[PDB]
Design a protein around this ligand. Structure first.
Ligand SMILES: Nc1ncnc2c1ncn2[C@@H]1O[C@H](COP(=O)(O)OP(=O)(O)OP(=O)(O)O)[C@@H](O)[C@H]1O
Ligand SMILES: N[C@@H](CCC(=O)N[C@@H](CS)C(=O)NCC(=O)O)C(=O)O
Ligand SMILES: N[C@@H](CCC(=O)N[C@@H](CS)C(=O)NCC(=O)O)C(=O)O
Ligand SMILES: CC/C=C\C[C@H]1C(=O)CC[C@@H]1CC(=O)O
Ligand code: MET
Lengths: 214, 569, 214
């Protein structure tokens, strides 16, 4: 069985979690105390020591975007996230690269940092939620006509939207309504529905990190 | 972290786990090396559900000659990846000849981890049969004082030299072996033959403490105990007077030896007395150090005739067969050290590489395809084919081995080997006769000192313009420079052929340089060779090296006891 | 003919250049100046404005690695950059990702920063380079039986190997002969030969970065 090393609030874990179940695989999840990184995990990733980690054929796969790629390529017979054309693949990989750079740090700034850093981050994430909404355009889903590779990549950030709203003391929806709109629409798929932990819990994990590092 | 019981168990488990670790090893070698050009033409992508079947079916057996021109590319200026993979830290050589031409092989870092694991186990198991003091040291005639570079500015290298030169080994040697008597500098001394009698000095120093005499083979021990014949003042007279003997002319070894010299007269009385009081030097070794539990090295097959002498030297002291394997390949280690040289047998190590053996069964040769190492039938002898990180895949070594039995789920192999070789027309000649004649005619000059030459070799360097020849000379004893200069002249003068003459007279190729090397170096070239992963026989050594031989090369540069160009011309 | 907008000193741009030269597919090179960037780069990339962008079929692909991944599949007939197996390609993306962040972060400190950053970058770089060496062990090309996906991706840093030596005070040959000389092998190939700019120009450029940037 496909072995997962996952973190309850790791959005990237979710990206693996969201990907596997999407395509149609029965898998196991292991919860990680990062204090004590797993013996199979350190064997899977000694230097990075990071998750999500999917293990197949006694072999470790690492990085979230990478894990969703492993997911597609390992049983390419039922559910492909990518379009047939190489270029649509390129756009999708491009759009996957977008979420990771400024988009991830921005939210990291919005619920991870305060003040001078905070407002910088909030202008950053609203800029990206704007870029995001415009690239979506009319689409049901970024990656393809149906569920996409990159749909899987940023759908997981949507549970942190509550965290972004509360510490951020801002409403992301009123300035960019359709991204957040689309995300609860994506929730309907069973993969994202079962994989994603509660937002109050995430909010409280974010609080836990805030309260400690003031 | 060395420990006796846990290491046994780990290796117990993996030898019993032979099939998984054999198949995982081949896979882990293919994982690490999935892009070999050699592999590319064969057509491998790794993974799959028939990787081992694909490996045997899609890849052909290979000889030294078509792999030569490949690994040549690594060393000559182009530092590029080839049969194995990435640019090699240095380059191997083999005994026998690749079409009468020099052999070539690369080494990697993983086989350095292999060094540390393999001595641990062999030494652990021997120490269970023969436990040893933690504060004791060891007399080991082992030397690695010489390091050469390829034309591309890349070291090309021997077992001995590289292992000792590599950074991890003094740190990694502390708890599995007795600290060497000899300073690393006298091990790393520019003059081995001088350092060698000083190595004797060294090993005897802490004699009550030393747990063994050690050479890789009896011949070295013999050589050394025939050097026990061949030295013993110098030491006494030079350790006596607090001044090293004047035979030693090298500063580095002079400084080291000097720091430890003060004038002691009572001991001469003692060292002396014992030594002329006994019959035949029967029991050299127990006489030196009574305390040594065993004699160590490889006593089987071809060193077997050198065993009587050792035994004569060894007296009642037990003779222990050493493990079998090398820079190209390591296969077997002794976990039953107690066993005698005659009954000596060897246990293949499982994670070192992937090994297929070609059966010799029918008459000669007989036509049979390769079978699994475990599949090899007990009692029957197969040719050895070796796949490992040294970069040979499905390469036939040319040696016959015998299956005596099985250690749990792992096979045992024994050696009665002579020379696993056929000759082809050479390219470094200047016929061996001539080269042997060359060395012989010039050696006479050093023979006025009544010292005889044990072994010799030659080299062509095409880096320099004009390219210049290099002769390597291995003689039992030290002498002045004028005579070696004369000898270099005669080497040129000794090659009797016309064509040699037209060019060195025309000087398109440089004056033959005779670089006199120190004693036991070519013996060292027996030291890693019979030890070489295969089947014992590896005893024909190519006499002159083109840029196609590299193990001998590393050996050649740094221990130039004397390095000179012909004053004539 | 596909048009590639490239920065001559940018390493990613070289990789796309290597990709098209490796395949034998003719292209027109376009030099982009950050000062007055062409309408197409701004048109192809509205937000990110990053080279090298390739336009094939009047469809512009962005990111260099993407260019590479897109390039491999859009012409898979002659040269395969990737192995056939999904898992071999698992190491692919992972190792591309490795070299792309850590390696790029280390080296940028070496040619683009001063003081402790250099020092930290040095040991980090040497370790990174060591990790490649140790993990790779004995491999001629990273990506498959011929030239590989992460060969190309890592080979672009070969141009900068001597600027890294000089600025860092460390020889990447001496501690790791294999990687620097893995760079010399690839140089013989016309791909790396003609897509990789001369050592002397980029080292001045990195040196110029020092004078220019305080
Ligand atoms: N399995 C193995 N394969 C190769 N080398 C090994 C293996 N195990 C240990 N070694 C060690 O490799 C180290 C160095 O030998 P080395 O490989 O450097 O020289 P080389 O250029 O490969 O070849 P050679 O000695 O034939 O010239 C030794 O210390 C040797 O013990
Ligand atoms: N590129 C990685 C990044 C993973 C990452 O940031 N992981 C965090 C979880 S939030 C982690 O594993 N941190 C290690 C730790 O907490 O010790 C991926 O997408 O998998
Ligand atoms: N994500 C793209 C863009 C990478 C990137 O940031 N490249 C640098 C070139 S070194 C760049 O474009 N810098 C633009 C700038 O300096 O403003 C890639 O990986 O190629
Ligand atoms: C690293 C293993 C230690 C044992 C091996 C080395 C020795 O200690 C003697 C030779 C041997 C190599 C050989 O068999 O050639
Ligand atoms: C004791 S370290 C390796 C010794 C080996 N017999 C050699 O001569 O290379």
């Amino acid at each position: 069985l496909p072995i997962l090393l996952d973190y309850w609030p790791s959005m990237f874990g979710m990206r693996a979690r969201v990907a596997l179940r999407e395509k149609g695989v029965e898998f196991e999840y292991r919860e990680e105390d990062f204090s004590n990184k797993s013996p199979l995990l350190l064997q899977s990733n000694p230097i990075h020591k990071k998750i999500p980690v999917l293990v197949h054929n006694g072999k470790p796969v690492c990085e979230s975007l990478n894990v969703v790629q492993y997911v597609d390529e390992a049983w390419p017979e039922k559910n492909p996230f990518f379009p047939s054309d190489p270029y649509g693949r390129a756009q999708a990989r491009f759009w996957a690269d977008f979420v990771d750079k400024k988009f991830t740090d921005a939210q990291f700034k919005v619920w991870g940092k305060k003040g001078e850093e905070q407002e910088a981050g909030k202008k950053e994430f609203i800029e990206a939620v704007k870029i995001l909404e415009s690239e979506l355009g009319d689409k049901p889903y970024f990656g393809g006509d149906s569920f996409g590779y990159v749909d899987i990549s940023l759908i997981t950030f949507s549970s942190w939207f509550q965290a972004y709203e509360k510490f951020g003391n801002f409403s992301i929806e009123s300035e960019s309504p359709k991204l957040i709109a689309w995300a609860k629409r994506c929730m309907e798929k069973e993969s994202v529905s079962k994989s994603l932990p509660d937002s109050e819990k995430i909010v409280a994990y974010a609080a836990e990190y805030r309260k400690n590092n003031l | 972290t060395f420990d006796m019981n846990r290491v046994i168990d780990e290796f117990d488990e993996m030898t019993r786990n032979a099939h998984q670790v054999q198949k995982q090893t081949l896979k882990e070698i293919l994982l690490k090396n999935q892009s070999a050009i050699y592999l590319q033409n064969c057509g491998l992508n790794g993974n799959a559900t028939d990787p081992e079947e694909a490996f045997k079916s899609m890849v052909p057996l290979v000889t030294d000659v078509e792999l030569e021109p490949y690994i040549k590319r690594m060393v000559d200026g182009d530092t590029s990846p080839i049969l194995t993979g990435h640019p090699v830290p240095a380059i191997s050589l083999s005994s026998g000849t690749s079409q009468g031409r020099p052999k070539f092989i690369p080494f990697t870092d993983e086989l350095m981890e292999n060094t540390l694991q393999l001595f641990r186990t062999a030494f652990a198991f021997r120490n269970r049969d023969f436990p040893i003091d933690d504060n004791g040291k060891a007399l080991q005639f082992i030397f690695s004082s010489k390091q050469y570079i390829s034309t591309g500015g890349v070291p090309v290298g021997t077992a001995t030299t590289n292992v000792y030169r590599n950074p991890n080994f003094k740190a990694g040697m502390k708890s599995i072996t007795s600290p060497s008597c000899s300073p690393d500098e006298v091990i790393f001394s520019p003059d081995v033959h001088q350092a060698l009698y000083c190595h004797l000095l060294s090993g005897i120093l802490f004699r009550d403490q030393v747990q063994y005499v050690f050479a890789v083979f009896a011949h070295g021990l013999v050589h050394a105990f025939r050097t026990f014949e061949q030295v013993w003042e110098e030491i006494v007279t030079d350790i006596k007077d607090g001044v090293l003997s004047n035979r030693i002319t090298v500063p580095s070894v002079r400084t080291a030896m000097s720091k430890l010299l003060t004038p002691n007269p009572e001991l001469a009385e003692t060292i002396r007395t014992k030594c002329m009081s006994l019959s035949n030097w029967y029991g050299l070794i127990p006489a030196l150090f009574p305390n040594a539990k065993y004699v160590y090295g490889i006593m089987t097959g071809s060193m077997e005739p050198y065993v009587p002498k050792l035994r004569h030297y060894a007296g009642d002291l037990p003779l222990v067969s050493h493990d079998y394997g090398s820079s190209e390949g390591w296969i077997a280690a002794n976990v039953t050290p107690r066993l005698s040289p005659e009954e000596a047998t060897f246990a293949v190590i499982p994670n070192l590489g992937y090994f297929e053996f070609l059966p010799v069964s029918e008459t000669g040769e007989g036509e049979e395809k390769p079978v699994g190492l475990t599949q090899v039938k007990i009692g029957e002898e197969y040719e050895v084919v070796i796949t490992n990180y040294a970069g040979l895949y499905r390469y036939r070594l040319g040696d016959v081995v015998k299956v005596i039995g099985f250690y749990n789920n792992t096979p045992q192999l024994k050696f009665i080997c002579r020379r696993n070789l056929i000759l082809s027309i050479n390219i470094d000649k200047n016929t061996e006769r001539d080269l042997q004649l060359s060395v012989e005619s010039a050696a006479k000059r050093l023979s006025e000192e009544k010292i005889e030459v044990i072994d010799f070799s030659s080299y062509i360097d095409v880096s320099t313009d004009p390219g210049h020849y290099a002769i390597f000379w291995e003689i039992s004893g030290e002498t002045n420079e004028d005579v070696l200069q004369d000898c270099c002249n005669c080497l040129d003068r000794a090659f009797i052929d016309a064509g040699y003459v037209s060019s060195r007279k025309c000087k398109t190729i440089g004056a033959l340089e005779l670089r006199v090397v120190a004693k036991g170096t070519f013996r060292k070239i027996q030291e890693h060779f019979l030890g070489l992963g295969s089947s014992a026989g590896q005893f024909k050594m190519p006499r002159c090296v083109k840029p196609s031989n590299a193990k001998v090369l590393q050996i050649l540069c740094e221990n130039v006891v004397s390095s000179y160009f012909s004053t004539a011309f």
